[PDB]
Amino acid sequence: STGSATTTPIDSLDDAYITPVQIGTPAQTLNLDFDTGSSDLWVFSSETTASEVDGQTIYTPSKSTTAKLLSGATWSISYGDGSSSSGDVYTDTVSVGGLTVTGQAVESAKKVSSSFTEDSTIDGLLGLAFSTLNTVSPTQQKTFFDNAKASLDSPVFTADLGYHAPGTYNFGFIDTTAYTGSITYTAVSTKQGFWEWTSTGYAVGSGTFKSTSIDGIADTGTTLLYLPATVVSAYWAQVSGAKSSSSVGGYVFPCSATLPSFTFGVGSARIVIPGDYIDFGPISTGSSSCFGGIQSSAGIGINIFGDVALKAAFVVFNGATTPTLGFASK
Amino acid sequence: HPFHXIH
């Protein structure tokens, strides 16, 4: 089996991308943020406290003939931004882009934090990291990818995120029309449960490539590219109005700048992020200051190749017994 | 309005 689904940015900044997923019987369509940085599939539901629901589409398990309560099981998760949710757990059929999994654990939110209530476009998250990070207790549940792998034509799923434009998430096949050249694969470490890999270096603009090892994670659910402080300082040093701003929380620069590109290594290959993708957006509508798309990871603790980097490439999450991460230009 | 998704 395979599936293929359109993923669309939630706003004109590409802050995040949603992908419709059909849950239950008959199917209830919810738009989820596919998150390779976590391993829970959770949704707003008929169980979520009413005052914490502000525009989202809820799953109602009592209307699904295939839903089953997983007795005794509860979950609680917090994310890097401080947001959180918790609740209980059903299994149900879940389909993405025509690929159906039966008995997928669907985590039903009894409570969600303020940031999720204010995000009207995101109905829940679909976690695609390794199932060791899943937060269901007492027994952890597999992600939708792990449950699909027995039926997939190939144990793989690709992310092709667009720049201010829709993209695609494919499961089970590699679309050779979707990228140019060849894919370079690199080793993944699953010791922390993440799609964790080591970039071989970087260059800014038309400058020299510096070989230096950058361990980071590929996270579709983080917007920006967070790199070590001295690498990010080398980048902004090439942009004449750029400065670090404590008030806004990162490097800002005049919107009227043309920004250099940023290249990162994958083994012997090079991925180039166009300058325009790094120009994330004005800090306020009508501002002449813009927020940059590469920021320091020092405060985070880990380096994160978020959507600004992944949307410059076609990325293959190879979930064979020894996983790997493939990157091609597109 | 960037997002930063487990901790």
For chain A, the domains span: 5-174, 175-330
Q: Which residues pair with A127 in a beta bridge?
A: A35
* Span between the terminal Cα atoms of chain B, in Å: 19
Task: Report the alpha-carbon distance of residue A13 to residue A311 in Å, rounded.
Answer: 13
Class of domain A175-330: mainly beta
Widest distance between CA atoms in chain B: 19
Resolution of the experimental structure, in angstroms: 1.6
Phi, psi angle pair for A199, to nearest 5°: -75, 150
Task: Report the alpha-carbon distance of residue A5 to residue A139 in Å, rounded.
Answer: 30
The C-alpha of B3 sits at a distance from chain A's nearest C-alpha, in angstroms, of 5
A171 neighbors A144 (Cβ within 8 angstroms)? no
Task: Report the alpha-carbon distance of residue A253 to residue A265 in Å, rounded.
Answer: 26
Method of determination used here: X-ray
Residue in the structure block whose two tokens are 């017994």: A321
Answer CATH for A5-174 from 2.60.40.2240, 3.40.30.10, 2.40.70.10, 3.50.50.60: 2.40.70.10
**Residue A237 CA: distances (Å) to CA of A19, A126, A233:** 37, 38, 6
A125 neighbors A59 (Cβ within 8 angstroms)? no
Of residues B1, B5, B7, nearest to A221 (C-beta): B5
Cβ-Cβ contacts under 8 Å for A238 (sequence gap 6 or more): A204, A205, A207, A260
Catalytic residue among A38, A95, A199, A296: A199
Describe the strand order of the beta sheet including A279-282 as a list of residue ranges. A243-245, A250-254, A289-292, A279-282
Query: Does the fold of domain A175-330 match that of domain A5-174?
Result: yes
Task: Report the alpha-carbon distance of residue A39 to residue A175 in Å, rounded.
Answer: 25
Total residues found in chain B within this entry: 7
Cβ-Cβ contacts under 8 Å for A22 (sequence gap 6 or more): A28, A29, A94, A95, A96
Residue of A nearest to B7 (CA): A79
Catalytic residue check, A153? no
Which residue in A308, A124, A104 sits closest to A216, CA to CA?
A308
Interface contact B2-A280, CB threshold 8 A = yes
To test the contact with chain B by mutation, choose from A13, A17, A32, A79 the residue with the greatest count of B C-beta atoms within 10 A, namely A79
Task: Report the alpha-carbon distance of residue A104 to residue A59 in Å, rounded.
Answer: 14
Q: Which helix (H) or strand (E) holds A309?
A: helix A307-310
Interface contact A221-B6, CB threshold 8 A = no
